[PDB]
Design a protein around this nucleic acid. Sequence first.
RNA 1: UAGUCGGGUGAUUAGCCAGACUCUAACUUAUUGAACGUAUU
Lengths: 210, 159, 528
Amino acid sequence: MRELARLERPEILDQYIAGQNDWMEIDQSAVWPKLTEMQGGFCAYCECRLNRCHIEHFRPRGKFPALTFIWNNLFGSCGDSRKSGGWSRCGIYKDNGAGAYNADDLIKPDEENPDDYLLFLTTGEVVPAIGLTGRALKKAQETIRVFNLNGDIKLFGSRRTAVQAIMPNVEYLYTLLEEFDEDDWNEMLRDELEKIESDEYKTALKHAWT
Amino acid sequence: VGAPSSPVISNFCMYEFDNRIHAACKKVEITYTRYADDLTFSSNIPDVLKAVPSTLEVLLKDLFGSALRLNHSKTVFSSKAHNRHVTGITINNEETLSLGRDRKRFIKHLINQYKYGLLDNEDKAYLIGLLAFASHIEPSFITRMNEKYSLELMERLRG
Amino acid sequence: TKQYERKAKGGNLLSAFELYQRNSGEWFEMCRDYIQDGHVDESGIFRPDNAFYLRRLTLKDFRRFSLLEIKLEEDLTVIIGNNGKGKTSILYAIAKTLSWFVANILKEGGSGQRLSEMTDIKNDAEDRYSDVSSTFFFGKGLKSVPIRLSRSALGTAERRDSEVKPAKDLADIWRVINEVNTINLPTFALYNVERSQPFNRNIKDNTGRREERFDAYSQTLGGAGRFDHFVEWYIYLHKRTVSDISSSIKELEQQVNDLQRTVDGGMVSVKSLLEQMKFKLSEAIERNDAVLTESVQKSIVEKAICSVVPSISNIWVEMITGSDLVKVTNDGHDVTIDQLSDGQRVFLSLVADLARRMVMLNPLLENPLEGRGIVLIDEIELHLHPKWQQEVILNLRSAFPNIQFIITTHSPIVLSTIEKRCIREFEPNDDGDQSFLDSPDMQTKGSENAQILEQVMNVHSTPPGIAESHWLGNFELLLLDNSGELDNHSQVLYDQIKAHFGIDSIELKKADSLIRINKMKNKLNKIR
RNA sequence: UAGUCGGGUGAUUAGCCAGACUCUAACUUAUUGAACGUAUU
Ligand SMILES: Nc1ncnc2c1ncn2[C@@H]1O[C@H](COP(=O)(O)OP(=O)(O)O)[C@@H](O)[C@H]1O
Ligand SMILES: [Mg+2]
Ligand SMILES: [Zn+2]
């Protein structure tokens, strides 16, 4: 997961008020293009390419009905309740499959940098970052557990495979550091790091390259 | 079904059913109508009609227990990808009521036969009856037939 | 009636048949043409104008299913899921439905099979009854043939009725039209896990005649086939072919010609044998000279078997020992059927049985294996080595191009040969309340097996319960904890990986790669 | 690709031409009764 930059707030959230209005009422096609600007057409938590996608309340509408029509609270997550059943990570699992959790002990990707908490191994596990204790460890652990970032075999598989595809190219660049002057080699690495913004699982590919 | 009172009684017995389901559908922007035992639901929103069958089963059980049940074999989903009809009337892709291509072609066939004096009296009577129905559902079709076949021929037929 | 006449002239088969029955020429010919008309496509395969297949299946309170709907493909549908997801239940439901067509093709008002009141009703269903509803298609003139099989649980005082009249109506058309003038008939077969059995040639079934056409329907939906019936039928065909004198003359003429060539090539030792065969040929010609359909039937089946079953290149009957033996050339060696491996025998049995039935039921086709039908196969990969699993669906579909196959499998290797549109997958945590089955998201045809394992079958490509499966991950984490340098702990694990997987292993190469990359990354960091 | 919709042609339920559509997804139905259309009055 990525550090997201939440920039501008859409007009429609002003109109609807919590208590009176329900989430079934609000029009969703107004909300999406601002999220798609933020998130780049990728999921908030896992970084798949969004195709079946829903608006997710980071703090849910049951436990926090005050935090409902709040631009901070909304994120575009992979999965859909409507089109098919039994989705097993991210938004849908946080509610259904991840049972009890304190929402305070989760990484919120708009507020925080995830990179200090999470580490992506090239073998395709996501793990807590090197040298965390107490609360910083507990956030890393619970984020991994609640969004099901290792436990979804479909996701674990896809990420592992995506990284293992590029590991010849990583290996090969860091041989050529010997031969070239700095500014050409630094341009080469800048380029590869430019491409992976178009790619799925961009954080995991970054950790492989950098 | 054969008794003159049965239509009235059956509609009455479905009154509460109709109230509840109509109200429920209206909240989610689904159009609902009932023609005797035939229930029709339509919407412009994708992925809302899938929930309706489950809702129906619950409501039927609530109101009638096990006495009235859905025919699960007769539950059919359709869209503008496919043929759509409601009580024998085709809804075309321009959102207009139609007899359907095959029926129109058949009527044209019969008119052509009449033009050459090949229709027997029984078939003629049949054709006349069908044209009255066509006039009610698709008046534009009659106009087209007048254009295709001479108003004189068609007037002669309908006289 | 005038109404039926209008519908019949519009191409409605049932109306045409009703008019035929009431008047009993025009209408008969309409019905017969509807069934027999077709054309040969660009690939040289016969295609019926009016196809027959199962369109849709609905299960209500049946075994594990509360209410389930399946849409089937006209050609191939593969059902996948874990053990206990109800894959076999689906095939059983279909097979019972098909039994009503078979019963009524054999006998007017014949009875098909029934749902079990002991086992088939869902255990916790509040309504104590079950329904299996099917819809079949038979061309544009008969777009919908609905059947329902129903059963109430054993105690229950209300009894729920089946609705089978449409099945009977369609089967009546096949039976009656066939009686007046021969038509090709549909094949219905179920091959479940019961098809694995020991072979005994010694046991012969003396119930009915194996050469009689409608014997093709005998135990067709019983699950095992009747491989014994095949062997009996094949020996029968052989005896008739050998007894036909002109083919014997042609065969003898060919043998004499082959022997004459050998004698002309300098082998004087076979001259005595040539003279004997020439005498036999002359005698055969002298005996009153007159192509056996039996000869063609035999050839068709032999070709089918050899084409579909990879290890078998030839099949024939020998009588010279004094008992009739079917022999096969298996992997270049001539063996008896009894000597085949269980995997080979079971697969041979399936194909042989299917081919026999199609030959018997499609006498008017140039290639009888291009006939119509619905064939159900449970666990297609049963006893098959991975190598064979890569061929099996392709071979079957090539040999039987107009059959609707409905298959179950646990094999990713099989799935790698099939399009995603043909696949129906259970949701991972189903609990028997899912309303509609769907296809996987990933394209399976041409994909790597390891990807199908993970993306379609929800199984790790490396066994998570083995510690060694995690060593590379642990190794990487140790390397990253010590700023990319091999410390004592990382070196120990490296040595363990080397010791366990070997010097040439993928795993060790990955470890080496990690070392190289991390060393270089650290050097860059120091320069900065 | 396929299926669907159907404006036109066509001694016409066919065939051919033109244009269009695509929630995993139509399968054209039943009278003498009831209602509706037309005729009759
Ligand atoms: N009458 C029944 N009520 C409830 N569950 C049943 C009933 N009959 C069978 N089952 C369940 O259905 C499953 C049978 O799976 P089966 O049809 O053999 O599928 P598969 O071949 O995929 O294992 C088991 O989980 C069994 O417990
Ligand atoms: Mg009337
Ligand atoms: Zn996600």
